Amino acid sequence: CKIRCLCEEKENVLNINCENKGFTTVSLLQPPQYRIYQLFLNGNLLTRLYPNEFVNYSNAVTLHLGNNGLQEIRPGAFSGLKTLKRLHLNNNKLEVLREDTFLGLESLEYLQADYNYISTIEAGAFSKLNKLKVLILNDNLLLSLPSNVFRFVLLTHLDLRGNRLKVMPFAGVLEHIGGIMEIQLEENPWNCTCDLLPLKAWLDTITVFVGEIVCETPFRLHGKDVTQLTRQDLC
Amino acid sequence: ETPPRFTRTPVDQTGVSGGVASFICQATGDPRPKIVWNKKGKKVSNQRFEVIEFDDGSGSVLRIQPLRTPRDEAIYECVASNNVGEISVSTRLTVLREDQIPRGFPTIDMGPQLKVVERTRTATMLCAASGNPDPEITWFKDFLPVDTSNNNGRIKQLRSESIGGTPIRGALQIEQSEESDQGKYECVATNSAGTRYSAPANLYVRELREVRRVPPRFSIPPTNHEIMPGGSVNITCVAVGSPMPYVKWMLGAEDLTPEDDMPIGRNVLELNDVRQSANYTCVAMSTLGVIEAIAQITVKALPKPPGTPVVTESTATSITLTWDSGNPEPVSYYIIQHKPKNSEEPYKEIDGIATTRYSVAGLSPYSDYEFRVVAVNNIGRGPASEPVLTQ
Ligand SMILES: *[C@@H]1O[C@H](CO)[C@@H](O)[C@H](O)[C@H]1NC(C)=O
Ligand SMILES: *[C@@H]1O[C@H](CO)[C@@H](O)[C@H](O)[C@H]1NC(C)=O
Ligand SMILES: *[C@@H]1O[C@H](CO)[C@@H](O)[C@H](O)[C@H]1NC(C)=O
Ligand SMILES: *[C@@H]1O[C@H](CO)[C@@H](O)[C@H](O)[C@H]1NC(C)=O
């Protein structure tokens, strides 16, 4: 803990702040083994995460990996993170979410991966993550979302703002959603044609929804909030 | 020094087996008092009983979960003490079985849910509870009661107001959320029959996401062109920004790009069979403004025939020529043609005469010659000039 890192005994758990110390590897520091804790690892230059790099963090509640310039997660890196609940992967350089990337977790219910350049998620990526309830993926490169990604989880918060989405189909992607309390689609290149109807329809059936969905395409419907729009305005 | 004095005393509770009961106790005095929880004068010690202190040190909440009956049914006492004095207060816990729950005992119809709020944004935890009589709703966070006594504060509780054929609505409204607001919230419904807890609901605090809006900007501003009459050319225009801007082409006032088919972020104007020069405006517009940038198409005409040369200075083996460009547009340079008068061969050319004067040297003595002037700019080689005869 103390030598190359700063630890604050918080009221409930232990806060370990190894933020911004320019670590390229997690080999150096010995975490506590029986005490529950949180680990801040922002601002540390590691290009990649290696298989089974994390193994002795049996009991870590939250882990921050932002501003690390992460490029890849070799198959099953988080091998030992048995009891991890909250994970951040923000502001890095990740393009693909392999289906076996999150191998280790059974207990995780929070996942933040914003600003990361993700162009294509794979379908089975979030499978075997039953406990997951929060998924944050805003400001990435998502053109389209492989069907049945969300079929095995029932999250309540999904943030897809600032991505590169033009259409979102009911069959597969959407039928699993609907159990959500919050969803965000705010800054996306929505192409408002009849081909965008399912989403629209699904937005009436869904409850507890808040947010704006403005037509990027076409010029006629530019700026118009789809929720305000009608099925005839679209055909 | 002053002896202890209670500012908050616990009240008798009737809970349901498997559920939760909490007792709250707070005291003041000088020095600050400590609090203990007893049963029958012996300090409580049980895996299901936990005591959670207030951060200020004023009190403690004794929480029992899961409730067991008759196990937990009892009188408990809160004792506050310092070296100046001691004070105690008793309270009763009752625990009912689900199969002897009365009609009217509060129910949780809907409970607070996992919620994620951005820092500085408002978070609202919600609860719907019903019962007979219509119950009061209070809130616990991380096992301590929520304080909303101060109506004038950051955390507010809201009314329903009067229900009704459905349950009573309770709202816990947390303005200007901060990391410390993160935690495990439970809503609690209480009436004269007893007390019921909701399932817990976690609140998460995510770092504020700021919508990066950027007014339009000519990523690729159109660059000017000059070409020969008909004459094609592709001029390209590119705009960027958030939101992404529509790009149209204009010829002065008229729109070239039809309105209902108008590209985003990039528009390349295809110009065919160019006839005359033209200023061409390119307009990019977002919801955050309108910018425009012109493209200078011009039609250049390769040189006219130069104005006939004149003999200014003639020597036995040299002949100086002074002419006019014979052009409206700048002439990049001139080429002089020379040959003998009775000669019937291709003209000998002298190149690169950047001025309208040049001394052709190397000529034979007493020999006639015929001279011509050819103009050149960037476009092409203009026709020659009407010849001058001399000796
Ligand atoms: C984890 O601890 C085990 C204990 O022997 C050790 O062998 C291993 O190298 C450690 N790995 C890391 C990444 O700390
Ligand atoms: C928008 O949708 C129409 C038909 O649905 C399609 O022809 C067009 O290419 C789409 N535009 C974009 C930018 O996706
Ligand atoms: C303009 O672009 C079109 C599209 O490919 C091309 O066929 C044409 O040759 C281009 N003309 C010029 C002058 O670049
Ligand atoms: C084009 O605009 C320029 C000024 O930018 C002006 O001097 C010129 O006369 C114009 N020419 C034509 C053909 O519109």
Residue numbers in the entry:
A (entry chain B): 29 to 263
B (entry chain A): 28 to 418
Sentences reproduced from the published study:
Presynaptic type IIa receptor protein tyrosine phosphatases (RPTPs) (PTPδ, PTPσ and LAR in mammals) can induce synaptic differentiation by binding to various postsynaptic adhesion molecules such as IL-1 receptor accessory protein-like 1 (IL1RAPL1), IL-1 receptor accessory protein (IL-1RAcP), netrin-G ligand-3 (NGL-3), neurotrophin receptor tyrosine kinases C (TrkC) and Slit- and Trk-like (Slitrk) proteins. All Slitrk members except Slitrk3 can induce both excitatory and inhibitory synapses, whereas Slitrk3 selectively induces inhibitory synapses through binding to PTPδ7. Peptide insertions (termed mini-exon peptides) at these two splice sites (referred hereafter to as meA and meB) generate splice variants of PTPδ.
After optimization of the length of PTPδ-ECD, we finally determined the crystal structure of a complex between Slitrk2 LRR1 and PTPδ Ig1-Fn1 at 3.35 Å resolution. The asymmetric unit contains one complex, where Slitrk2 LRR1 binds to PTPδ Ig1-Fn1 at a ratio of 1:1. Ig3 is spatially separated from Ig1-2 by meB. The concave surface of Slitrk2 LRR1 surrounds two strands in PTPδ Ig2 and meB (234ELRE237) with a buried surface area of 644 Å2. Asp167 and Glu215 of Slitrk2 hydrogen bond with Arg236 of PTPδ (the third residue of meB). In addition, Asp142, Asn166 and Asp187 of Slitrk2 hydrogen bond with Arg233 of PTPδ (one-residue upstream of meB). Slitrk2 LRR1 also interacts with PTPδ Ig3 with a buried surface area of 450 Å2. Therefore, the present structure clearly indicates that binding of PTPδ to Slitrk2 depends on meB but not on meA.
